[PDB]
Amino acid sequence: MFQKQVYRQYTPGFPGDLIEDGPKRARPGRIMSLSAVNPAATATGPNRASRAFGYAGDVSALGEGQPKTIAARASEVVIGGANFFGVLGHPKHYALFGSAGDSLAPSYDLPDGAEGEFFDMATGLVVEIFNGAAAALDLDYGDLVAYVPNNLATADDALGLPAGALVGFKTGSMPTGLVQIPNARIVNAISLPAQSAGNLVAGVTIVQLTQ
Amino acid sequence: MFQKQVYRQYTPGFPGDLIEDGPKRARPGRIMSLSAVNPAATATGPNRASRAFGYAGDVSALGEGQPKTIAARASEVVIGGANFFGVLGHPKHYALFGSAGDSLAPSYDLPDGAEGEFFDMATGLVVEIFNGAAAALDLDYGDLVAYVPNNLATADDALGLPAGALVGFKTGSMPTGLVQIPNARIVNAISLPAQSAGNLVAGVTIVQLTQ
Amino acid sequence: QGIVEPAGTAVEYGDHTNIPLTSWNANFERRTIVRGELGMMVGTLEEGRASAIRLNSAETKRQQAAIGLETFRNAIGFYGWQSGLGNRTYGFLNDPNLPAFQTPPSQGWSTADWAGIIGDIREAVRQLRIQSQDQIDPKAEKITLALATSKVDYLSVTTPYGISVSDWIEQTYPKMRIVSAPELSGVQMKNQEPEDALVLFVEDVNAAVDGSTDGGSVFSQLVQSKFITLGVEKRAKSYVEDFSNGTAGALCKRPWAVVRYLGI
Amino acid sequence: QGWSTADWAGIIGDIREAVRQLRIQSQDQIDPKAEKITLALATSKVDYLSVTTPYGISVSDWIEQTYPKMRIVSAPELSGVQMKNQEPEDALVLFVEDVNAAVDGS
Amino acid sequence: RLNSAETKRQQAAIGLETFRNAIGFYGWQSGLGNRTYGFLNDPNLPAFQTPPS
Amino acid sequence: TDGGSVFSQLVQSKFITLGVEKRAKSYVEDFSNGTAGALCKRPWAVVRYLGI
Amino acid sequence: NFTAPVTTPSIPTPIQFLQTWLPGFVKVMTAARKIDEIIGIDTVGSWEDQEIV
Secondary structure, three states, rough: OOOOOOOOOOOOOOOEEEEEEOOOOEEEEEOOOHHHOOOOOOOOOOOOOOOOEEEEEEOOOOOOOOOOOOOOOOEEEEEEOOOOEEEEOOOOHHOOOOOOOOOOOOOOOOOOEEEEEEEEEOOOOOOEEEOOOOOOOEOOOOOOEEEEEOOOOOOOOOOOOOOOEEEEEOOOOOOOEOOOOOOOOOOOOOOEOOOOOOOOOOOEEEEEEEE | OOOOOOOOOOOOOOOEEEEEEEEEEEEEEEEEOOHHHOOOOOOOOOOOOOOOEEEEEEEOOOOOOOOOOOOOOOOOOOOOOOEEEEEEEEEEEEOOOOOOOOOOOOOOOOOOOEEEEEEEEOOOOOOOOOOOOOOOOEOOOEEEEEOOOOOOOHOOOOOOOOOOOOOEEEEOOOOOOOOOOOOOOOOOOOOOOOOOOOOOOOOOOEEEEOO | OOOOOEEOOOOOOOOOOOOOOOOOOOEEEOOEEEEEEEEEEHHHHHHHHHHHHHHHHHHHHHHHHHHHHHHHHHHHHHHHOEEEEEEEOOOOOOOOHHHHOOOOOOOOOOOOHHHHHHHHHHHHHHHHHHHHHOOOOHOOOOOOOOOOOOOHHHOOEHHHHEEEEHHHHHHHHOEEEOOOOOHOOOOOOOOOOOOEEEEEOOOOHHHHOOOOOOOOEEEEEEEEEEEEEEEOOOOOEEEEEEEEEEEEEEEHHHOOEEEOOOOO | OOOOOOOOHHHHHHHHHHHHHHHHHOOOOOOOOHOOOEOOOOOOOOHHOOOEEEOOOOOHHHHHHOOOEEEOOOHHHOOOOOOOOOOOOOOOOOOEOOOOOOOOOO | OOOOHHHHHHHHHHHHHHHHHHHOOOOOOOOOOOOOOOOOOOOOOOOOOOOOO | OOOOOOEOEEEEEEEEEEEEEOOOOOOEEEEEEEEEEEEOOHHHHHOOOOOO | OOOOOOOOOOOOOOOOOOOOOOOOOOOOOOOOOHHHHOOOOOOOOOOOOOOOO
């Protein structure tokens, strides 16, 4: 939308980009549509970057006759998930793919059946963080993070939250229905304002230590 | 000079040094004077190397007027913090600065406002260990480590343990007032004698795996 | 850096009288050096996709590494680094050996006429001439005016007869140099509004005038390096590069040649 | 508040403030004296540039000599812009024509 | 890295110059009876006055 | 990367001349030397008795 | 079990190194002498003389 203000310095980084170099683990995968989930999904959302994903199944069979050919090792994932399969990242790898209203529009969404890179271990990862309980929250250096499941009950989801959004919380208190990513730390302090249903603040970009 | 005894072998390493090569993580920081803490420090000590340090705040503002320039991303640390930040190490980085009496005197502490490197992950790190139970203790290969906070009550600190010393303990016999470091192991054998207040045996430096 | 400070006094001459002698006495000062770091990483497929839109990914990231380090160095030049914590770095606006800020005769250049603005500069030069006892002549001394970007446009204030502030400055002080900087706009945040600053100082003092072994250099910027390549690490599908720089801040060596105003 | 019922110095201050904003919005990256700035102004207020001091200095002479590269244009669409409580408000727009490639790496 | 002899010699020269300048501005022992006098201390001078402003 | 020797005597100079002053009926000469004592670099190889 | 060192742990590099000394020296300036620019200078007599008439 063009630069309407001149600042003294540039932004540290963008969500989905690695910000520090160190030990790292990532695997490829393919995306399943939410409609294919058998017990139906109570929480829905797009396949947006910088959001958690869950394991779905194995698609390495590649055949239908009596002798099958296993020529590759592949896995497929779902946006919400209950079996953690990393966080989507590295936006420079993919393409715009266009948008519904018009192409050439900014978006982090990815179509179903596309291939992405999901990070399990990362020294520094810029992500988009959310807030729970609809109250002002200060994270500071060492809080934990969790992500919304597909099957989150509507009672525990009063604030409309995406399918796989990342939510930070203090050690003592955690929202009732969430899945905690083991051994993850906030690393970068951040403050978030109060929230309301339908008017959730998107939060601010933040560094992450996935493992 | 100063060598009055001859032993059969060399020491494996010195505290604050890397003893093995592998995955590792470190961050820089600036040390805050312990007197700056508001609720006061019940446990005190110097900024000795191979001691745990805690996050204190952000000092990246770098300005005094209405607009400020965020030139760098820097973190500010204190000798003892509830949020774990790292362990000071790599003594070759710093300068001696002598001592109050005369220069060229052995010193092993850093002054306030100085930089340092703190470790969050290390395959092998030599650190000094302490006994927190005032009794004989044998650690063995697989154990856990913890560090003293400043807000440790004197009732739980009958032994005069320093501000940020590291304490080893068994799986189910952790002291009452310490803070555990997740996924930390001793990965080496060591034995400590009986202990008493005022006659605190400093223990023996031992290898330790941070993460 | 050091100081010389000679001493000695003379008496009347005599054939068989005692001979007076001279001596000296020195002192020293210290500062600290700070280092910065910044790097980059590029993958194989990222470059291929970037070339589709006619953009060089590796070169763009390399340029930002140099720019990011320059911003770190530039900020230290104006404000000290961790001066509150105890680090002895300091900067242009934070040096301890400075004459300290003052309130100008005119309350502010805003809502001030031609006479008010011209009076402020005259007083600053008078203090500079009083402080150094006729050692420097402002007519032919090559003095520098710092000023601020929010106040640099007030030099075009004109009288009803067409005479402007800049006309008087050029004729009275032909060798004066005028600059500006955004970092001098918001300085101390007096009540609820930023306060613009004005710094007047001499660029250099002649060796014959003083006798110092070094140059004049009233203000000096201590830079160890501006851009150093640490190394390149090559991996299977990517490579990483590192860069660094060093600086020590600003040092004021002759505090008697500086005049500064706090409020506009 | 308004160029109407304003003297020569008052009108000059408004033009000075507009030039100051350009040097402030961009952090001292462009100097207005060598940028070929264009002044939009309004039809109902373009005639106020002829205000003169008793000595004989006009507003237009000050602009034409201090900023030789400035261009003055008039347009009727800028007379009634926002249609205030009961009167129209005349607008004034100041902008730079071109930006050099040395200023920014575009 | 400092030469003491050169510094002392320069200081001696500067002190002699200062003495000469002081004698030039103010006379030497004019009250005692010595006839040296100076720019601002000559006994036969029209004496100071006060300006209108 | 040293000569060992356990003990060492640190002597800056044995004999140097300062200057000569000549007078009407005599002259004077001055001399000087410097030393720093003894240093024991390997105290693990010394056995000493106070009596006997 | 880890053996005992024979020397006290310490930071190796003393601060007397790692220092850069600027080549110059700053000298005190004091006031100026300007009698010659006011009244000029003239050589009349010689050293070891007495009076001028």
